[PDB]
């Protein structure tokens, strides 16, 4: 659908799209600037990865409260709604899957393979970590393994390299250890390993503070700060 | 305080 | 798209997209049940207007920015970026336009035929009064007149209705005179006109307080205080 | 403050 405009008006329109917060449309045009087929920019990767958190975080957020009351529905002495409130959520989250892999589609052809750069490999491999998690948050079947393992592995992956690559107060760094966090704990049941990466996490971007220029590092910052959020609400 | 993700 | 699905169901749904903040689905679920071509009772009534308030505030929103950024890059001094804003801001404009005909001819084939009950007739010829607004906040051609004068009219035989028909702290009653006086102050240029709207509003339904229930007037509050807040900005 | 409507 985008195939027609210039790759700088798309990623133009997709800056005037997130002043707008209009996500949907921020997403498509990234879409269609990834399909030209050129690497993104750091700038650029932003954009991307800003659009289809959004759409997807109000996805996940409609099927979060549609799943609780269904949940309900299913209780001790809860009664026989009928099935709208299963179709109504399983198309909300028919919905959720396709835009998950719509993006784990742009990863693997071709952001993934193409990306060099320590910044760029691990901000896609988080990318793809992230929505295979946002499918194993849906999954109740015979493939959840699967896609936990799939989520595990990018994860596990962007660790490798950005430990390598990249200093702990990397705000990419900072990221992929937060949300690797949060897969551990909710997702592969391991809260233990949870809180022993957020704690690293931030002590080890403590400990390298030092070296930072500021206000060079408000996104490393606010990071920090959700690292700690969630030590203390799981301790 | 729903835990939170980046 | 929604003539399988039960009125009952449609219903249902748009119940658990209100709760989902599923705004649009909200709206496509309001749709098939009018036009199953039964009238919508009271509660149903809300649903609808809702749905369509959130979808095409949004939208407003979105059109509004990029409005005031296509302004900025035509004013002295501003340097020529290209078509992208202006294309842009045209499609939120078509699909804003778009949203509003499909109320408006929801409302014309058949809620307001059909509606004899005043608080109905009234919601309903609100409705078309607030969506020729909005169709009037983006036109800039030959039209312009004739959709103001559209929006005029519905909201003049809508408060003719309430005046005879409602007391004056009935919440259709008070949203409708709020509405029309944002109409007067920036849409037909009539500050003050839109002034003496709200405070006569206001003022009488302050003096009708002492004929009510409570907590049964919680909507009728909170518009009084619109109605005030309005009076506050504007004088 | 942007006026009012509902
Ligand atoms: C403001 C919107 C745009 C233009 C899209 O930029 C989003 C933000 O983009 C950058 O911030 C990134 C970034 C975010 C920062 C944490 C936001 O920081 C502040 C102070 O607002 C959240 C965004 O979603 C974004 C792009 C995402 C990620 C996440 C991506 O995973 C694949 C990993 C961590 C984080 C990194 C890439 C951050 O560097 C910038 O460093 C931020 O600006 C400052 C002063 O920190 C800007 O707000
Ligand atoms: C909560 C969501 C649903 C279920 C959709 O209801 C929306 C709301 O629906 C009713 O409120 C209506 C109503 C609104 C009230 C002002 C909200 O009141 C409070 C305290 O939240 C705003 C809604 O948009 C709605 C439906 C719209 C209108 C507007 C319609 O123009 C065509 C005219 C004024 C206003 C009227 C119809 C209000 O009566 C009810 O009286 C409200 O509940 C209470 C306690 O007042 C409920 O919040
Ligand atoms: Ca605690
Ligand atoms: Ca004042
Ligand atoms: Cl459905
Ligand atoms: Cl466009
Ligand atoms: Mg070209
Ligand atoms: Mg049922
Ligand atoms: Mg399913
Ligand atoms: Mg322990
Ligand atoms: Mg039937
Ligand atoms: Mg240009
Ligand atoms: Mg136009
Ligand atoms: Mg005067």
Redesign the interface.
Known sequence: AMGSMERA?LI??AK??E????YE?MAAFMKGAVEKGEELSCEERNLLSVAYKNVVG?QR??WR??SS?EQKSNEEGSEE??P??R??RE??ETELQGVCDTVLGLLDSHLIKEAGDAESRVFYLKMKG?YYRYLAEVATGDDKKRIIDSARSAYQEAMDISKKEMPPTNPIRL?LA??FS?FH??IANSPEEAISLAKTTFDEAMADLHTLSEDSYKDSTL?MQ?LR??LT??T | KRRKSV
Do not use: H
Not at chain 1, 19 to 22: M, T
């Open positions: 008006s133009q329109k005037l799209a002043q707008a917060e209009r449309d109000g957020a409609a409260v549609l009351i709604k009928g709208e409130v179709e109504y198309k909300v992230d990221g937060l949300n949060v704990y909710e990071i959700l959020d969630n609400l799981w």
